[PDB]
């Protein structure tokens, strides 16, 4: 319980966001992790938005003066992990309610249990492929989530490999892989520069 400098992983922060040259709107969130391949990057979750982003909180002009709050993210350990373990790595239908109240479910996959906020859970979706955090316990409890069913280790993962793809406006997404998921080694977290969202992809 000490460290020479930084290590703000797991403690919430507050900073302002400036888009281009627009308004300085104030955001507060929780730092969840840091990536070792390039240690200038942190993962964040903002109170209000279930999504998780990846920002270079100290190497980025866009972020405002960085304030580290004394608020504590109460660990608040989960009652029972039996159900949590049943759904890590599976495929589930996530029920979503439109503002009008109409039904709309997305077929997605529960990647694994989240870090820092333990009740919250990682998830990616098929037609929308980015890293989200939802308290899926609440979901399954109220009935808005259902589960459809289904020797010596090799080199496996290729984290740290830069990748490239083909897009329309004479451009290609350029980023690198940053994580091998424990439940399914096929999928990986990939971060694309000029974008501040974490993508979860199956690279076969």
């Amino acid at each position: 319980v000490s460290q020479p400098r930084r290590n703000i992983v797991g403690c919430r922060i507050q900073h302002g966001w400036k888009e281009g040259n627009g308004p300085v709107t104030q955001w507060k969130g929780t730092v969840l992790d840091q990536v070792p391949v390039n240690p200038s990057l942190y993962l964040i979750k903002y109170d209000g938005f279930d999504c998780v982003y990846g920002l270079e909180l100290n190497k980025d002009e866009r972020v405002s003066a960085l304030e580290v709050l004394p608020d504590r993210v109460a660990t608040s350990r989960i009652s029972d992990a039996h159900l949590a373990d049943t759904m890590i790595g599976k495929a589930v239908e996530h029920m979503f309610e439109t503002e009008d109240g109409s039904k709309d479910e997305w077929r997605g996959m529960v990647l694994a249990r989240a870090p820092v906020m333990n009740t919250w859970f990682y998830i990616t979706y098929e037609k929308d492929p980015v890293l989200y955090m939802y308290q899926l316990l609440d979901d399954y409890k109220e009935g808005d989530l259902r589960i459809m069913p289904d020797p010596g280790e090799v080199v496996d993962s290729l984290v740290g490999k830069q990748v490239e793809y083909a897009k329309e406006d004479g451009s290609k997404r350029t980023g690198m892989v940053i994580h091998q998921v424990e439940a399914k080694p096929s999928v990986y977290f990939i971060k694309f520069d000029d974008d501040f969202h974490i993508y979860v992809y199956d690279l076969v």
């Binding site: 966001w17 903002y46 938005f49 279930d50 999504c51 996530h94 029920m95 309610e97 503002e99 808005d144």
Partner: peptide, 9 residues
């Protein structure tokens, strides 16, 4: 019961 409106900023 969750909403896609709160997904991101």
């Amino acid at each position: 019961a969750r909403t896609k409106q709160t997904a991101r900023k």
